[PDB]
Subunit: 115 residues, 4 copies
């Protein structure tokens, strides 16, 4: 599993469940092409977005739909989404975990990159 | 000043100086139009991006050029940029401060919205 | 002002107003001696804790009374307080800003150390 | 496993490995008593600190020895440690994950609390 997304809720102290995630890959013409999508599980995790074969070198954008999440809990939040934009695999295949910690007017994101 | 950007460096414990910032407004055709830009000061701040008159309700994107900042310090970073996307809503008088705290593989962002 | 504390609220998108802050210095017997205290202002800031003369090298603890802040907003929080413990080192002239970004189950803290 | 600690490195984009963690529990006389200790694994995780039987209601302090960690990588960091202080089990047994994301002059911490 070369690309995993983990989302936590800093208000509830819980995984952020049923958070929609859209992944895009920049195409040769500099447009964002849809790559993969899914939603976080009861553990706040999203696995199975892509495969080692399909996850080639490129610039990827991980869009985490935080506004839809907060709205469903009665919070009118600040951000539309949290966007994580990075070059992947440019020194060969790596495994990437994109983690996000959400609050209504703030978020933090990190990456864990393993060989 | 309706819109200020503040950038801090979590590796040096300092303001993040000379960081390029680009602000975009979402157009009717759902494309991102350039709106304002500049470079953070010696205090990590960027003021004077826009005016009360021009900063109407809409969806805005603040792109912080973190990759060039880390490259200038000789540190390999993860992200291409940090992106903060939000709706500006006129409910009363308000000032938006977008703050970001940068690390090579992580960032934190918050909004300080005041009257 | 050698030592300033700044507190932000990640749920409201605001300064964290009227937060009690206690500063301690580590004594020779390895106990924490009260040093300075106060409450954040309407801008989330606490100035005037100490002087250049009194703020000598040593180990300091900044305790931020987050639990009382969340209780006053009717929100169940995780932590008893947020604690920032650091050594003050005289290398050149410097000002320490301790910043904290609060959520009910999370906090972020950074140091901005300037000349 | 009712108390787990997870530590990430925001500079390297990796688990924070071999981070020492000390847990204390406030005694009736308001002193901190040693409760448990250990170090993070190659995954940045510390399991097996306590048992459901021993982890009774109380105020706990999780001290993460971040200064020792950074010093071993050639970084003179700001903080002495990251301290996470909380009341545990006061509505019955819960499972607690204390997560921390480290930078030289900053850290973020959150808790995931499950029934
Ligand atoms: C898996 O990698 C993982 C990660 C985390 C925590 C991530 C995290 C912590 C903090 C303090 C942040 O600011 C960010 C952005 C991420 C937790 C877990 N759990 C819940 C076991 C797994
Ligand atoms: C003014 O608004 C301001 C803000 C801050 C710090 C911001 C900040 C801290 C932490 C811990 C974060 O995680 C985030 C995202 C933002 C500091 C200052 N200074 C430098 C006076 C001013």
């Amino acid at each position: 599993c070369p690309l995993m997304v983990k989302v936590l809720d800093a208000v509830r102290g819980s995984p952020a469940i049923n958070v929609a995630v859209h992944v895009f890959r920049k195409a040769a013409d500099d447009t964002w092409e849809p790559f993969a999508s899914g939603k976080t599980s009861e553990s706040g995790e999203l696995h199975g977005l892509t495969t080692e074969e399909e996850f080639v070198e490129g610039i990827y954008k991980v869009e985490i739909d935080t506004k839809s999440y907060w709205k469903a809990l009665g919070i009118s939040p600040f951000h539309e989404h949290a966007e994580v934009v990075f070059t992947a695999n440019d020194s060969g295949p790596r495994r990437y975990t994109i983690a996000a910690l959400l609050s209504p007017y703030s978020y933090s994101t990190t990456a864990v990159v393993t060989n």
